[PDB]
Design a protein that fits this description.
This is part of a larger assembly, with eight protein chains of eight kinds.
Chain D lengths: L18 H11 L4 E5 L3 E7 L23 E7 L1 H22 L5 H17 L8 E9 L3 E7 L5 E4 L1 E4 L3 H11 L7 H14 L11 E8 L4 E5 L2 H19 L1
Antiparallel strand pairs in D: 1-2, 1-7, 2-8, 3-4, 4-5, 5-6, 8-9
Helix pairs in contact in D: 5-6
Chain G lengths: L8 H9 L6 H6 L11 H14 L4 H13 L25 H8 L8 H4 L25 E3 L18 E3 L13 E2 L7 E3 L12 E3 L10
Antiparallel strand pairs in G: 1-2, 1-3, 4-5
Chain H lengths: L16 H11 L4 E5 L3 E7 L16 E2 L4 E6 L9 H20 L6 H17 L9 E7 L5 E6 L5 E3 L2 E4 L3 H11 L2 H5 L1 H15 L7 E7 L5 E2 L2 H18 L1
Antiparallel strand pairs in H: 1-2, 1-8, 2-9, 3-4, 4-5, 5-6, 6-7, 9-10
Helix pairs in contact in H: 2-3, 6-7
Classes of the chains: A alpha/beta (385), B alpha/beta (396), C mainly alpha (176), D alpha+beta (249), E alpha+beta (233), F alpha+beta (116), G alpha+beta (215), H alpha+beta (246).
Chain lengths: 385, 396, 176, 249, 233, 116, 215, 246
């Protein structure tokens, strides 16, 4: 609190000085730039010809040509002349063409995919590491399997042969499978692409094998990388029609995965991380190793583990030092992560009704008896069963 | 940690905001990307603007029609999707303008300036073929009989068609690959491709079937034609249960999609002209789950056996996997191989690798015999169980 | 796709008389005249335009049509019925005499060594159509590569009969 | 064909339990309600008939509550159709046990035996389990006054006040709230019975035609099972007006 | 349901081919025929040290002179043993001679394939059995070991092992054992393959061994006598 | 809510039959808060950003987040399909399950959630 | 300075320095890229390697690029070496002066190389702690974590859960610099602080050395 | 036993869909732990679901199959309540038990019941109309040798002898929690076995000794089902003890 504060105040102030110093450089201070670069720009823009019509640079031919596809609608076989070199152009990028007669002027700009924008979500877990404790042994494993062959090459090189190519995170929700993928990805800072399994089965047919191959192929280009496939139970569970359920849809998606991961087309040291809450839906071929390598199983929380699982939920909320953990272990046990989330939410819910804007032991206790009953009730009790 | 997380959250927020302004503002600051060697090229570039032959428009020649009255007529499809008929190149050979060949034609005059390298006629077929690596026999377990037939059938007629003439048969049009999965079939397939110096083109059956059927038909035909241009090639169709599944068509299911794509492939197998020395290799679980209709046995030739490793058989794969790897061991390859039940090759291969991951856990950096012993017990249980559907009731 | 049929036949009508070879007829001979939720909807229309082109408008009796099927459990009944396709030529599965006759051609092509004891080779084979005759000769040649030798013999030709009959089938049982 | 369908009657479903058993409970919900209440010197059944019609002739005055025996009574909660078969099985079992036993039939004994038939169908025979939960009221010496509840699931329960049929969750609590363990006598209990029926119905307004009330009261040497005539129930419908005040107060 | 009449074009049932995979997850059984007896070895499957080897067995008596050790799916073995036990005892009253090891194996073998999706009775099934049984006993023709399998075939064998890997456990047994040899060497040969194929290793409560000599009754081994056979693995 | 503890509202289920003026109260608070009340009646009619559900989570969230706050009022009438009622019991209910689970977990938006 | 993170940062920096002028920059960068010397540095070397193989035309540039690839090294089972004494994090620059001078002056001369040779400093991979009167020579398991939940700790010990690293197993700098000896349940405290110091570690042991642990 | 489809069709997994589905059906009959003593073999069950308008007899997972053999049930899952499907296995089991008393009149053997049950489940497979089972039973009873027996059976058809076993809410999990608690003293002391059963049930259920009903059975005396009230007295001490072993 007070110990932190002097340094915090200083960091914000160091950053202020940094902002203010930029303004003086762009406006007044020049030495190599001068009036001279201003004129270089004018002279280059007029020769270059504004508007510049966008193209995409697929590949460069060394003889003073390039093969461009103009983005207007009809492609052109241009020359590489005027303010760029063959090597200065880079593949899969957006380039400037002279509008009057198309020769490729150059690459200032890069082209991002339309696909990647939607898929992508930023890397960082909202529950900090070493506070996703509780099955603490398990948390370590993912750091070893996906993160490590990319972070540290030393062990792998001495070990020899093929590295890992995935992990599968499975078992009851609430043991934090999403938080783990995000941690390793954060650390490496490998582009984290994220798609829910339900996108694999949508109304249009063959979208599933299509999305998954494009997603991977994009991961290889933007490599090293982490692909997260969140909650692949949907394949069978969902259908918009007869064609969208059933064997053709289920097979095509599974079949694509098999070729993509270790098969002919392969992948680099790009890892796929799969979250699944049921491996009942998943086959023995995607639970096969060497395209999954170590599988991580989370079991139901143990009596001692349950106290550590409860702490994580309590940390996101307000920090308890007045909750009796024994009462929770005594009342229910060998119930999911999801049950510990259920006790927490219900306490917050009763406090909300009063307009009490805290949770205390009292809110946890009052809600706790109804929640245990409620767990059993969630699955049918019928008339009187 | 509730009070501690807010402090940190605010401090980042402020520093992050300020950054937005600095980045935008600095930019590249009115510089030129080309630098000094392109200055001479600017002067050229201007001459070209005056010129009518620049810019060229890429197109493709769709069809050859003669009613010649100047110099040979060709109909090309422009990428604004207007058809135009153009004529023989200004100085280049007529033998460079062909059907399914790419050509550069003038934007302002529309006559063939220069022909270009061929193929861009399908959009989809170009997408369906993917990257090619090579892995060698060392890396793929076993020197067994099952391994040996793959080479003899694929490598020998394509490498030397001479041998196949001597016997008095043609080099296979078709070749069949069968064996249950998790045996390293794809791995073995990559390994023969390097030796033969026969290009392998990998293909996925899941791309072929699509919502409206017909795309997969044109794709398959175009795909055979491309391969036909290549000499001593293999079209390897991986993971197919479209061109690979059961023969049956429901008539309101995704089964329609399968049946069009299979049906063109039958036409291709025979060919418009035969396919002596061209191999298509197809992977199926076993030949009894493959069509009796797409399988018209004379053309397909040999069926190459691969089978699920035996207890002896897995003893053999495990020495290759271990030897390739860098490992320090005291315990032997046979013991651990007998330790495994009959299941798949894949569990037994993972042991060799898992012993290396236990070494990092153990706080070594290379494996030891105890890591090895630990790996068999966990691995046999893990991969085999906790998988597969819990129903085989009410399916077709 | 349907329009293309109409145009393609029109092309044949100009050129007339001509023979239009149609390889296979489950894609312009689907059995179905009622369907929903499938790619079979477009496939049914190409098939229906075909029925119309055969119907009488003259110069299209001049032009001929060959259509082929390996099935009957997906043949379109109208196209089978006359007045679309007048002739119905059946090809049966080779007779005992015929099976020996085809099979003789194949052994002949191969380096001379399965032309000895040819009566025995002719008899033992069962349910061989033409495809199976070619299938045995190539599989026999394969066995000569296994040995590592350039000499072929009658015995390999015999092992092939068991090995391929358009199936895996190795002729074996799980009893004892 | 028959091999391409599902109904998961004898076959277990992904649930671990059959569809047919769970569905039967839904049918019971939108059909007329039956409750049994405990008194100190008798037991009683009160039921809502399956007839929502405004005109009944009373051809059969058992259209919900049927008196099986001179020692027993039942109610129907569910479909009247599956009840018809069950009613005939009950007149035989109830009298057979009595021929032998010479003692008023135990409420528990009857239900467990019956529940066994309900489960027999769902498990085997390829028949669905009856869409009727039967509410048994009786008296035997070794438990005392009893009420037992029967399900299509083969579940039985020993109760003192319970209700099954429509809006059952509300109904059992409402019987608990007014009537604790061993609190209320037979006459005052008959009133309580009508009061819950007025509130809970498939279709509102409680009348003589819509209700049938049955008493088990032990008379001088015999246990007497009577279904009350429309006339007597009416005196209870005014009593039920008085009862609403009384629960609150 | 989905076809239970399912033939492949080769000419065998898919369902029978599926039946073996179940055996592979289950328990391990070794039967060896010796001139001097029949020894039967079976996995007890320890998993607590509280499970008592004397009180519970998986070497079980068909007759007082005949034993059977079970492998694969446990439920399935019990149904075959109960019909076989009665057949055997009824045989004894009638003939007054012990039942041949072959005679009992033939009866059980009838049950293995008779399945069909519909028209099923107790003599028929909805899916073929995935257990292989080693019926070992001493009769008047001498000590015999007959082997019955999931395909419902009976074969005479002087050594058979079936378990985690059926073919695997039999290949270890093919290396060691010799046809005609002493009782101790046959008992040693049964234990030795057993630990190597399994995940589990050899103990005296890990496995159960009982030996039938000719001229003896079936004896289930005592705590001490079970431990004596462990010294020679 | 930060003080109360529990994550800011992810799923709030308003359930029960209409005609009690359940929609009307939602409109009232949504207007006052100055969140845009975007009504889904069970339809991917009003997904025009690709026009099929399950991507109606991601595109819809990004637009809503950009011009934030938003209250996405998904009315699950579920009168769609006859083979979407075997996918979740509503075409819309399949979409809603995708959206619910994903959005709870997504980025920092669980106890920083403000697009309800 | 040891500012935060080393997993992402030298790789990222090699890319940006291509825009900036001078081949000498690349050589100076490689100094940061040391840290745990087979952990970060294998990647850093490979990336600069590509661009160096890419284009060359004067002996001068080639000489700079050569300095950058090899200088970065100290690898395969060789310990953590970075400019730092382990114990100091209050320390003043006087060990800096020999490389510092060499960054400031021309590195386009070969002459710069005398001063540049020495950047002599050690951190250790040893976790050999000296007990109260045991004086033990055996190593000690530790837990490492990148970040903290408190400023109650700022003497660089984090919780004993986290991710475990071993005894005689690579000690790594920022984003994994903080080090506790995992053994709070065994009630042992370092007297001499743990980071993988250059100093011979010392503990007051109320339970001796903990063995290895899997995780 | 009449249907028109097969009850199960085989898989290449080597599992029976109906037996696994049955295992969940028997965890409907909630959690049951039984430990074997020197002279009192004791089992106790989870939930009596008391509301003091009910009877305690009707919900029981403790069923008397004979007056010297008794059993408590479950296996694995976490699924909803229902006594009834489990109750049906009891009704078969009780005939099976009683037919043996006719055959052998001395206190009937545990072994007989378990074996009959494994075979009974396979048999139901064969009939197309018959619903299979897959359960675990904690068979308790005595021999004619007077020695204690506690046996347990599994859905896999396999029965084993044990000194303590628990079933319910993860069969391996409640069983392992007992493995810790077990010591050599426990089984001879009469007092100690009772505390083991109550610590296992106390884990999954709130406020036991109202949701802990246990029966002791004896060598000379038949089944005694204890009142809940005397069990609650134990639960209070024992819960103190339960935290200690953890």
């Amino acid at each position: 609190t007070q110990c932190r504060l002097k340094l915090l105040k200083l960091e914000r102030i160091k950053d202020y000085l940094l902002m203010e110093e930029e303004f003086i450089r762009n406006q007044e201070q020049m030495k190599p730039l001068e009036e001279k670069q201003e004129e270089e720009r004018s002279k280059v823009d007029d020769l270059r010809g504004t508007p510049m019509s966008v193209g995409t640079l697929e590949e460069i031919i060394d003889d003073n040509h390039a093969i461009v596809s103009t983005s207007v609608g009809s492609e052109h076989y241009v020359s590489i002349l005027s303010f760029v070199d063959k090597d200065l152009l880079e593949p899969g990028c957006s380039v400037l063409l002279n509008h009057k007669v198309h020769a490729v002027i150059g690459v200032l700009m890069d082209d991002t995919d339309p696909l990647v924008t939607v898929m992508k979500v930023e890397k960082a877990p909202q529950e900090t590491y070493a506070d996703i404790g509780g099955l603490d042994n398990q948390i370590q494993e993912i750091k070893e399997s996906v993160e490590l062959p990319l972070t540290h090459p030393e062990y792998y090189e001495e070990m020899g042969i093929k590295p890992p190519k995935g992990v599968i995170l499975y078992g009851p929700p609430g043991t934090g499978k999403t938080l783990l993928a995000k941690a390793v990805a954060n650390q490496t800072s490998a582009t984290f692409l994220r798609v829910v399994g339900s996108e694999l089965i949508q109304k249009y047919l063959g979208d599933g094998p299509k999305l998954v191959r494009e997603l991977f192929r994009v991961a290889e280009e933007h490599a090293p990388s982490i692909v997260f496939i969140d909650e692949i139970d949907a394949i069978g569970t969902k259908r918009y029609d007869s064609n969208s359920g059933g064997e053709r849809e289920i097979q095509r998606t599974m079949l694509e995965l098999l070729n993509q991961l270790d098969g002919f087309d392969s992948r680099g040291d790009v890892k796929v991380i799969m979250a699944t809450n049921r491996i009942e839906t998943l086959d023995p071929a995607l639970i096969r190793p060497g395209r999954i390598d170590r599988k991580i199983e989370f079991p139901l929380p143990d009596e001692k583990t349950k106290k550590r699982i409860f702490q994580i939920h309590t940390s996101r909320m307000t920090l308890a030092d007045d909750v009796t953990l024994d009462d929770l272990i005594m009342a229910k046990d060998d119930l999911s992560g999801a049950d510990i989330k259920a006790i927490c939410t219900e306490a917050g819910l009763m406090a909300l009704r009063e307009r009490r804007m805290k949770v205390t032991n009292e809110d946890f206790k009052k809600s706790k008896e109804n929640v245990l009953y409620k767990k059993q009730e969630g699955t049918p009790e019928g008339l009187y069963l | 940690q509730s009070t501690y997380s807010r402090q940190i959250k605010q401090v980042e927020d402020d520093i992050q905001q300020l950054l937005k302004k600095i980045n935008e503002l600095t930019g590249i600051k009115e510089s030129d990307t080309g630098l000094a060697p392109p200055a001479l090229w600017d002067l050229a570039a201007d001459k070209q603007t005056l010129q009518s032959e620049q810019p060229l428009q890429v197109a493709r020649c769709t069809k050859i029609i003669n009613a010649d009255s100047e110099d040979p007529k060709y109909i090309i499809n422009v990428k604004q999707f207007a058809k135009f008929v153009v004529d023989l190149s200004d100085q280049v050979a007529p033998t460079d303008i062909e059907e399914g060949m790419r050509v550069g034609v003038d934007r302002n005059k529309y006559q063939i300036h220069i022909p270009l390298p061929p193929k861009i006629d399908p959009t989809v077929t170009m997408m369906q073929v993917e990257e090619k690596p090579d892995v060698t026999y060392s890396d793929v377990g076993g020197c067994k009989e099952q391994i040996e037939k793959l080479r003899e059938v694929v490598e020998t007629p394509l490498l030397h068609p001479e041998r196949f003439v001597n016997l008095g048969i043609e080099p296979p049009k078709g070749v069949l690959l069968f064996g249950p999965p998790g045996t390293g079939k794809t791995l073995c397939a990559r390994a023969v491709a390097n030796r033969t110096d026969a290009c392998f083109i990998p293909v996925i059956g899941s791309e072929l079937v699509q919502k409206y059927v017909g795309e997969g038909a044109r794709m398959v035909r175009e795909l055979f034609e491309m391969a036909r241009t290549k000499k001593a090639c293999l079209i390897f169709f991986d993971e197919i249960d479209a061109i690979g599944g059961a023969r049956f068509d429901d008539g309101a299911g995704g089964d329609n999609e399968v049946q069009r794509t299979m049906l063109e492939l039958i036409n291709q197998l025979d060919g418009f002209d035969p396919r002596g020395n061209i191999k298509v290799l197809m992977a199926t679980n076993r030949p009894d789950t493959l069509d009796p209709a797409l399988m018209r046995p004379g053309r397909l030739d040999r069926k190459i056996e691969f089978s699920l490793p035996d207890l002896e058989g897995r003893t053999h794969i495990f020495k290759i996997h271990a030897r390739s790897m860098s490992v320090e061991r005291d315990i032997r390859f046979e013991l651990l191989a007998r330790l495994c039940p009959n299941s798949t090759g894949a569990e037994i291969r993972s042991v060799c690798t898992e012993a290396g991951m236990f070494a990092i856990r153990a706080r070594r950096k290379i494996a030891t015999e105890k890591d090895f012993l630990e790996a068999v017990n966990k691995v046999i249980k893990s991969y085999a169980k906790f998988s597969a559907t819990p129903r085989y009731m009410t399916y077709n | 796709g349907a329009k293309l049929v109409r145009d393609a036949f029109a092309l044949a009508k100009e050129k007339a008389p001509s023979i239009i070879f149609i390889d296979e007829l489950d894609a312009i001979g689907t059995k179905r005249f009622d369907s929903e939720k499938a790619g079979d909807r477009e496939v049914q229309r190409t098939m229906l335009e075909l029925l119309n082109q055969l119907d009488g408008f003259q110069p299209n009796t001049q032009v001929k049509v060959i259509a082929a099927t390996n099935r009957v459990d997906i043949l379109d009944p109208a196209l089978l019925r006359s007045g679309r396709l007048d002739r119905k030529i059946e090809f049966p599965m080779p007779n005992e005499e015929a099976r020996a006759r085809i099979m003789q051609i194949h052994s002949r092509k191969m380096n001379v060594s399965p032309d000895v004891n040819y009566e025995e080779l002719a008899r033992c084979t069962d349910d061989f159509n033409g495809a199976q005759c070619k299938a045995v000769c190539v599989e026999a040649g394969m066995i000569a590569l296994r040995r590592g030798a350039t000499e072929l013999t009658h015995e390999d030709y015999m092992e092939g009969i068991l090995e391929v009959q358009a199936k895996k089938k190795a002729n074996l049982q799980y009893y004892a | 064909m028959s091999r391409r369908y599902d109904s998961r009657t004898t076959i277990f479903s992904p649930e671990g339990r059959l569809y047919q058993v769970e569905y039967a409970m839904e049918a019971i919900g939108h059909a007329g309600t039956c409750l049994g209440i405990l008194a100190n010197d008798g037991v009683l059944l009160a039921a809502e008939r399956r007839n929502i019609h405004k005109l009944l002739d009373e051809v059969f005055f058992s259209e919900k509550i049927y008196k099986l025996n001179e020692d027993m009574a039942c109610s129907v909660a569910g479909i009247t159709s599956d009840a018809n078969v069950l009613t005939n099985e009950l007149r035989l079992i109830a009298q057979r046990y009595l021929l032998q036993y010479q003692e008023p039939i135990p409420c528990e004994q009857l239900v467990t035996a019956l529940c066994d038939i309900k489960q027999a169908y769902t498990q085997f025979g390829g028949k669905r389990p009856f869409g009727v939960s039967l509410l048994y009221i009786g008296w035997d010496k070794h438990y005392g006054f009893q009420l037992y509840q029967s399900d299509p699931s083969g579940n039985y329960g020993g109760w003192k006040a319970t209700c099954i049929g429509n809006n059952s969750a509300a109904a059992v609590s409402m019987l608990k709230q007014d009537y604790k363990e061993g609190e209320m006598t037979l006459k005052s209990a008959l009133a309580l019975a009508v009061k819950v029926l007025n509130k809970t119905m498939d279709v509102s307004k409680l009348s003589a035609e819509k209700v049938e009330i049955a008493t088990l009261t032990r008379e001088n040497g015999k246990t007497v099972i009577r279904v009350l005539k429309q006339k007597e129930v009416e005196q209870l419908i005014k009593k039920h007006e008085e009862e609403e005040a009384k629960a609150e107060r | 349901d989905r076809g239970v009449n399912t033939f492949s074009p080769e000419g065998r049932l898919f369902q029978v081919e599926y039946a073996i995979e179940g055996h592979k997850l289950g328990s391990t059984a070794i039967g060896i025929q010796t001139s001097e007896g029949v020894c039967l070895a079976v996995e007890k499957r320890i998993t607590s040290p509280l499970m008592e080897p004397s009180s519970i067995e998986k070497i079980v008596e068909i007759d007082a002179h005949i034993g059977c050790a079970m492998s694969g799916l446990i439920a399935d073995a019990k149904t075959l043993i109960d019909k076989a036990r009665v057949e055997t005892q009824n045989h004894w009253f009638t003939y007054n001679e012990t039942m041949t090891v072959e005679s009992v194996t033939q009866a059980v073998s009838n049950l293995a394939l008779q399945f069909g999706e519909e028209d099923a009775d107790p003599g028929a099934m909805s899916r073929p059995f995935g257990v292989a049984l080693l019926f070992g006993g001493v009769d008047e023709k001498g000590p015999q070991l007959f082997h019955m399998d999931p395909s419902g075939t009976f074969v005479q064998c002087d050594a058979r092992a079936i378990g985690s890997a059926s073919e695997g456990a039999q290949s270890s047994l093919q290396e060691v054992y010799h046809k005609s040899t002493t009782l101790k060497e046959a008992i040693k040969s049964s234990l030795i393959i057993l630990k190597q194929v399994m995940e589990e290793k050899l103990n005296a409560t890990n496995i159960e061994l009982a030996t039938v000599q000719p001229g003896q009754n079936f004896h289930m081994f005592t705590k001490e006598e079970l431990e004596e056979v462990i010294k020679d693995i | 809510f930060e003080a109360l503890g529990i994550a800011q509202p992810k799923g709030v289920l308003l359930y029960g039959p209409p005609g009690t003026g359940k929609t009307l109260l939602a409109r009232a608070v949504a207007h006052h808060t100055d969140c845009t009340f975007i009504r889904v009646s069970g339809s991917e009619l009003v997904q025009k950003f690709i026009g099929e559900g399950a991507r109606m989570v991601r595109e819809l969230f990004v637009m809503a987040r950009e011009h934030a706050p938003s209250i996405i009022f998904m009315d699950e009438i579920d009168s769609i399909g006859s083979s979407r009622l075997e996918g979740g019991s509503g075409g819309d209910s399949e979409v809603q399950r995708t959206m619910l689970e994903l959005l709870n977990q997504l980025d920092g938006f669980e106890a920083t959630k403000n697009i309800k | 300075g040891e500012p935060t993170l080393r997993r992402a940062v030298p790789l990222a920096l090699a890319l940006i320095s291509v825009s900036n002028p001078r081949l000498n920059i690349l050589d100076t960068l490689s100094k940061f890229s040391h840290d745990a010397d087979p952990e970060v540095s294998y990647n850093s070397i490979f990336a600069m390697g590509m661009v160096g193989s890419g284009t060359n035309n004067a002996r001068l540039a080639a000489m700079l690029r050569q300095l950058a690839q090899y200088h970065a090294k100290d690898p395969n089972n060789l310990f953590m070496v970075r400019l730092a004494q382990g114990l100091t994090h209050l320390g003043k620059g006087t060990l800096t002066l020999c490389p510092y001078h060499s960054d400031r002056q021309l590195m386009s001369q070969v002459a710069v190389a005398g001063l540049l040779t020495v950047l002599v400093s050690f951190l250790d991979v040893r976790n050999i702690i000296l007990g109260k009167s045991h004086y033990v020579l055996y190593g000690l398991v530790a837990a490492m974590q990148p970040r903290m939940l408190v400023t109650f700790d700022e003497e660089l010990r984090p919780l004993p859960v986290s991710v475990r690293v071993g005894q005689a197993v690579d000690v790594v700098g920022q984003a994994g610099k903080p080090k506790t000896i995992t053994g709070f349940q065994t009630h042992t405290t370092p007297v001499l602080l743990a980071h993988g110091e250059r100093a011979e570690l010392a503990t007051e042991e109320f339970l001796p050395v903990t063995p290895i642990l899997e995780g | 036993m009449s249907y028109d489809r097969a009850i199960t069709v085989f898989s290449p997994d080597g599992h029976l869909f109906q037996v696994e589905y049955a295992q969940e059906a028997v965890k409907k009959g909630s959690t049951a732990v039984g430990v074997r003593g020197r002279d009192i073999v004791v089992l106790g069950v989870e939930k009596k679901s008391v509301a003091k308008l009910q009877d305690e007899r009707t919900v029981r997972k403790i069923c008397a199959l004979d007056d010297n053999v008794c059993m408590a049930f479950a296996v694995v899952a976490s699924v909803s309540g229902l006594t009834a499907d489990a109750r049906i296995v009891i009704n078969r089991a009780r005939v099976e038990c009683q037919s043996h008393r006719l055959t052998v009149g001395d206190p009937v053997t545990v072994e007989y019941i378990t074996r009959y049950i494994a075979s009974l489940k396979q048999r139901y497979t064969q009939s197309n109309g018959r619903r299979p089972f897959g359960i675990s039973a904690l068979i308790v009873g005595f021999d004619f040798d007077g020695t204690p027996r506690l046996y347990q059976t599994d859905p896999s058809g396999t029965y084993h002898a044990w000194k303590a076993n628990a079933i319910g809410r993860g069969a391996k999990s409640v069983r392992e929690f007992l493995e810790k608690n077990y010591t050599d003293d426990a089984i001879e002391t009469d007092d100690l076995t009772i505390k083991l059963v109550i610590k296992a049930l106390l884990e999954v259920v709130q406020s036991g000794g109202k949701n802990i009903e246990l029966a002791v059975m004896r060598r000379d005396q038949p089944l005694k089902i204890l009142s809940p009230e005397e069990i609650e007295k134990y639960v209070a001490e024992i819960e103190k003890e339960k935290e200690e072993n953890e």
